[PDB]
Design a protein around this ligand. Structure first.
Ligand SMILES: [K+]
Ligand SMILES: [K+]
Ligand SMILES: [K+]
Ligand SMILES: [K+]
Ligand SMILES: [K+]
Ligand SMILES: [Mg+2]
Ligand SMILES: [Mg+2]
Ligand SMILES: [Mg+2]
Ligand SMILES: [Mg+2]
Ligand SMILES: [Mg+2]
Ligand SMILES: [Mg+2]
Ligand SMILES: [Mg+2]
Ligand SMILES: [Mg+2]
Ligand SMILES: [Mg+2]
Ligand SMILES: [Mg+2]
Ligand SMILES: [Mg+2]
Ligand SMILES: [Mg+2]
Ligand SMILES: [Mg+2]
Ligand SMILES: [Mg+2]
Ligand SMILES: [Mg+2]
Ligand SMILES: [Mg+2]
Ligand SMILES: [Mg+2]
Ligand SMILES: [Mg+2]
Ligand SMILES: [Mg+2]
Lengths: 127, 83, 101, 206, 151, 99
RNA sequence: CGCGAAGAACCUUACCUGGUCUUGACAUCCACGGAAGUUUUCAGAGAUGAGAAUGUGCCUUCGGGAACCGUGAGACAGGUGCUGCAUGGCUGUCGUCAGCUCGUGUUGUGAAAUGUUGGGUUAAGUCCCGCAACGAGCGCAACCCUUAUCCUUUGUUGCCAGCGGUCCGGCCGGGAACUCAAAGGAGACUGCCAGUGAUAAACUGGAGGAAGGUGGGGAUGACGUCAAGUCAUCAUGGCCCUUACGACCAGGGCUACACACGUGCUACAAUGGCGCAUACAAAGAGAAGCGACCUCGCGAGAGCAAGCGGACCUCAUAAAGUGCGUCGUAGUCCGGAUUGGAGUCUGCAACUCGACUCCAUGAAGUCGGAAUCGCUAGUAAUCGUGGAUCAGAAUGCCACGGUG
RNA sequence: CAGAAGUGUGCAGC
């Protein structure tokens, strides 16, 4: 049966199902290499399975929604790490050291009245 | 410019006067405030005293003027150098 | 606002309902018409200019209901930014309260 | 500097709204306008009947108005003959059929609106403002407020230059959102002009 | 800051060569957050430098950076009525930061037909102990030794 | 056929007790009910300058939250639809019904 | 100094020229005659004048009364006229700085002092010891909203793990798993463990956890200073006008142009321009509305017309990006001001003075003197999207998400 | 090590 993890990052959310199998990865019915064109995403999606050293022993089915490229990549990494901790809880102490278990909370800071941006203040002049 | 679907614009209260002025032969200059009215061909050879905000300015309708608005010939602001 | 401005505005609002709300056909059906003869369209164009000018809805200012202020009007409430806040903090508006996020 | 209006910041936390009805944007403004008209009328009408508060509710395409007053018998009228006039004129103003309810404010000395109006009336009676303020504070405290403060502003005593004068007793924690701070304002139209009276009454937290 | 001291933010190593130093270099060459553009430029420059040098990419980059990292810098020190330039032993992390900044800003102002090629040329010159990044390092050392009297 | 009720209010507790009354009276009347669904809370934001003059940067920001609830009567027998027509609610609730 | 103004073609409008009225455009009272009103003409720029053609609510306890209209006399209306240095209310600022005070006691002839100072500590008059002080109040902190983790409940208009069907479309039967919607609850407390410290308060490091020391952000602004801002939002004392500083109307102006300054937008290019293909958002609005599909047009748009008071329909194919080609350091295939020509749309009406589309034209500008400004992390930078005001009319303002 | 000047005149808080 499927082992499950929800993960999320910025506005992106991902559902990850993992199962024993020959290393297949599918995201939104697309190959990893087809869905992501940027090497950073292709690396971060592997990072946890690389460190666990199971890339050739597990396969996973993923769907991901919301946010852009890196948001979804991080959301997938987070879901993968949760699901594989459900698969083998003994790995948690390792993943804690890897830093993946922390749900990255850096949301976008809302604009504030009187400021052009989150913090960019208008140009000031003495006179 | 006005949508080509609608055709050019003239004020009725001006047209009623253009009519009798053409019948009379522009016997006297036709005062008007309809600066927005278009110059129609029937107006050629008339003199219209178009309001400018404080005076009526005589415009003599030359054939070249057709299709312009009357107000284009009555400047509204006075400038003559700063010094 | 000067009381005359209030009388003038309500006069315009009333007058607009006596004509264009009914005779809008004259423009929307005829002066805008393509399927019909240009002579009728021309006659309608000329006729529309005979309606009292203040009957056009485009001439309504849309003032604040409680003080007649023209600027800073809010269409949800019918009030200026001033009177809306005065009523708001006194709790006269049935669901409005200060936001935070 | 300036302070937030202490009622509005507490709306929904501890203070309820004085109007309660749901409306779509189409009729919202007309409801708000007719509510304003009825409030203005009732305030002008009952000016001596110590009306503390007016709550307007619009159920079932009807209006019902609850009036909180420290002098109910004057508002009701003998045999209720007066509420008939109020409800009929309110039905005229709102157009929808009207119902009126009246509620006693048992202790007007603990009501910021009635205290503010009392001080205002006394000022227009040419009472010394110090005495009016002191009397108000002392009565509120002896009747069991957890605290009070009062303020009066502008051309006090006909002075040529305006002042603000304020007096405080007990505890009055305006930054505490749990605090049920009652608050109100009134204005005295003396021969010298407008004197502004503000009243805060603290009745305990939560 | 005057109250705090800050712990360093977590960096991610370069995905192709595994180097945090190359990651910092990319982050310095990056403009407007166009990370992937900078990555492409850096990879092209490194591969062309590699084939020029007969070296691995990181090896050529390291030997270039060795030639430009400064050993000392000049710092303004206040005295009760004067200010003196005084040489200070710059620490290694700031050495790397300075060397990368100097390489990047030197390349940026070259005339060559593309940023990747400008960069490759500047790294070659640096490895060859020549050019603008090296003269920058040099004159920094000159100034330090000229101020050595106050150290 | 089903009947479907949408409740709107400016108070989630008032809307809550309204839905509770609906569900309890309906099931007491033998209705089959598919339970109250919370639809997304449409909210309006306003910004106003609070000075009578100038001071463009001095502003207050306000919101109105409209709470929604959906409930479906999936077997509306005559007595159930009658009872649901008989209920009255506080004016803070708008009830809109469909068949 | 993109400030009131969250939006000046008419209106707005308060200004100018001219034309008009005088108990008045807006209110109450009083007397007289009439329902109100509708359809229509001739004058005039229009205001306003004239004149025709049409029309009777409710008791009438019949005298009229209820609306509205006109007329007529006075009280009176009206004033965006002056005083913000006569005021209320509201707002800016020092400043979200950590301060500011009072009761009783005590000290001093007294103004006053102590407390509130001292040793540590904190974001903090935060906390602990000491001390003629002992207590308290307004401030700090907390309560409030939002965000980062989990759990219960409900499960359509939202979802699709696992099952049958499939036209390959969650689209079908179906499931309530998952995302999500949103009501309720849990969690963070220096709570736990070493070390330092004055057997103190608290500091350093560690465990666990989604989060660690105010976890991030917002709201919240003490006593008071600046005779700070507003009599033009409004209210108001005093003063001034009352055939005019009041009222109606058309046209014009607020959009001028020798110049000087502030805040922004677009650029000077290759970390780029152009062309073709193709990925990944959030948050809002919609009935005098948002407007699909389809047909027509190079385009702005036009015709027809579905749906939606909306987790359903429309606004609406996000752009940066990724792949491929081309340009070759050029005042250029950079830049797109200016100006001619032809059009669309809103509107009684785009001359003064709107927006946008097409064709053509193709300035200055090659990183900016003295000087000066913002920002400490999902920040700066950079790229798109929405909304209010609004018939039409953002490079401004208020919000959202992507890369970072 | 250098760094000068700031017109006259008023009114509440008893
Ligand atoms: K003031
Ligand atoms: K004392
Ligand atoms: K005044
Ligand atoms: K601009
Ligand atoms: K618009
Ligand atoms: Mg400034
Ligand atoms: Mg308008
Ligand atoms: Mg600004
Ligand atoms: Mg004008
Ligand atoms: Mg002034
Ligand atoms: Mg002190
Ligand atoms: Mg101390
Ligand atoms: Mg304290
Ligand atoms: Mg002490
Ligand atoms: Mg606080
Ligand atoms: Mg002043
Ligand atoms: Mg003025
Ligand atoms: Mg005018
Ligand atoms: Mg202007
Ligand atoms: Mg060049
Ligand atoms: Mg900071
Ligand atoms: Mg952003
Ligand atoms: Mg001198
Ligand atoms: Mg002096």
């Amino acid at each position: 049966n499927q082992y499950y993890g929800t993960g999320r990052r910025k506005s992106s959310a991902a559902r990850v199902f993992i199962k024993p199998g020959n290393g297949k990865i599918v995201i939104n019915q697309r190959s990893l290499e087809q869905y992501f064109g940027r090497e950073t995403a292709r690396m971060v999606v592997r990072q946890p399975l690389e460190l666990v050293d199971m890339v050739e022993k597990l396969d996973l089915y993923i769907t991901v929604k919301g946010g852009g490229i890196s948001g979804q990549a991080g959301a997938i990494r987070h879901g993968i790490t949760r699901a594989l901790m459900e698969y083998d809880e003994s790995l948690r102490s390792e993943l804690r050291k890897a830093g993946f278990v922390t749900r990255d909370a850096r949301q976008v800071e809302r604009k504030k009245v009187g400021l052009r941006k989150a913090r960019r203040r208008p140009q000031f002049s003495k006179r | 410019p006005r949508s080509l679907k609608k055709g050019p614009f003239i004020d009725l209260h001006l047209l009623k006067k253009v009519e009798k002025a053409v019948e009379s032969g522009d016997k006297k200059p036709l005062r008007t405030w309809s600066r927005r009215s278009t110059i129609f061909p029937n107006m050629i050879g008339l003199t219209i005293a178009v309001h400018n905000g404080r005076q009526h300015v005589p415009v003599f309708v030359t054939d070249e003027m057709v299709g312009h608005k009357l107000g284009e010939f009555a400047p509204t602001r006075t400038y003559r150098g700063h010094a | 606002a000067k009381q005359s401005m209030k009388a003038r505005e309500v006069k315009r609002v009333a007058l607009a309902d006596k004509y264009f709300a009914k005779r809008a056909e004259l423009k929307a059906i005829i002066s805008d018409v393509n399927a019909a003869s240009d002579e009728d369209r021309w006659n309608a164009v000329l006729k529309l200019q005979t309606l009292p000018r203040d009957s056009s809805p485009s001439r309504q200012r849309n003032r604040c209901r409680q003080t007649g202020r023209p600027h800073g009007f809010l269409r949800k409430f019918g009030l200026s930014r001033i009177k809306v806040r005065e009523a708001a903090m006194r709790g006269e508006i049935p669901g409005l309260k200060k936001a935070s996020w | 500097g300036q302070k937030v209006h202490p009622n509005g910041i507490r709306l929904g936390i501890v203070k309820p709204w004085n109007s309660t009805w749901f409306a779509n944007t189409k009729e919202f403004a007309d409801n708000l306008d007719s509510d304003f008209k009825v409030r203005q009328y009732l305030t002008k009408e009952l000016a001596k009947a110590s009306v503390s508060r007016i709550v307007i509710e619009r159920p079932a395409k009807s209006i019902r108005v609850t009036i909180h007053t420290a002098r109910p018998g004057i508002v009701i009228g003998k045999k209720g003959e007066d509420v008939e006039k109020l409800r009929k004129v309110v039905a005229d103003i709102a157009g929808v059929p009207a119902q009126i309810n009246i509620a006693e404010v048992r202790k007007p000395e603990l009501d910021a609106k009635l205290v503010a109006d009392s001080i205002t009336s006394q000022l227009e009676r040419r009472v010394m403002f110090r005495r009016a303020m002191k009397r108000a504070v002392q009565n509120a405290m002896r009747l069991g407020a957890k605290g009070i403060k009062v303020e009066v502003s502008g051309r006090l005593g006909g002075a040529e230059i305006a002042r603000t004068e304020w007096y405080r007793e007990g505890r009055v924690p305006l930054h505490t959102l749990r605090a049920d701070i009652d608050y109100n304002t009134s204005e005295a139209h003396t021969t010298y002009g407008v004197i502004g009276v503000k009243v805060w009454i603290f009745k305990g937290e939560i | 800051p005057r109250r705090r001291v800050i712990g360093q933010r977590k960096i991610l190593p370069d995905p192709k060569f595994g180097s945090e130093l190359l990651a910092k270099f990319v982050n310095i060459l990056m403009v407007d957050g166009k990370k992937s553009t900078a990555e492409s430029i850096v990879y092209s420059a490194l591969e062309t430098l590699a084939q020029r040098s007969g070296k691995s990419e990181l090896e050529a980059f390291e030997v270039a950076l060795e030639n430009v990292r400064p050993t000392v810098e000049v710092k303004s020190r206040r005295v009760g009525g004067s200010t003196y330039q005084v040489p200070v032993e710059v620490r290694p992390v700031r050495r790397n930061a300075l060397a990368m900044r100097w390489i990047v800003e030197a390349a940026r102002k070259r005339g060559d037909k593309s940023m990747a090629l400008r960069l490759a040329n500047e790294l070659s010159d640096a490895a060859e102990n020549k050019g603008t990044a090296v003269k920058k390092r040099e004159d920094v050392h000159r100034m330090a030794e000229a101020n050595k009297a106050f150290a | 056929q089903r009947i479907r009720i949408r409740l709107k209010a400016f108070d989630h507790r008032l809307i809550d007790q309204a839905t509770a009354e609906i569900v309890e009276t309906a099931k007491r009347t033998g209705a089959q009910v598919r339970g109250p669904i919370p639809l997304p809370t449409r909210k309006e934001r306003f910004t106003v300058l609070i000075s009578p003059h100038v001071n463009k940067d001095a502003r207050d920001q306000y919101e109105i939250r409209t709470h929604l609830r959906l409930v479906d009567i999936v077997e509306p027998t005559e007595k159930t639809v009658d009872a649901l027509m008989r209920l009255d609610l506080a004016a803070g609730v708008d009830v809109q019904i469909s068949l």
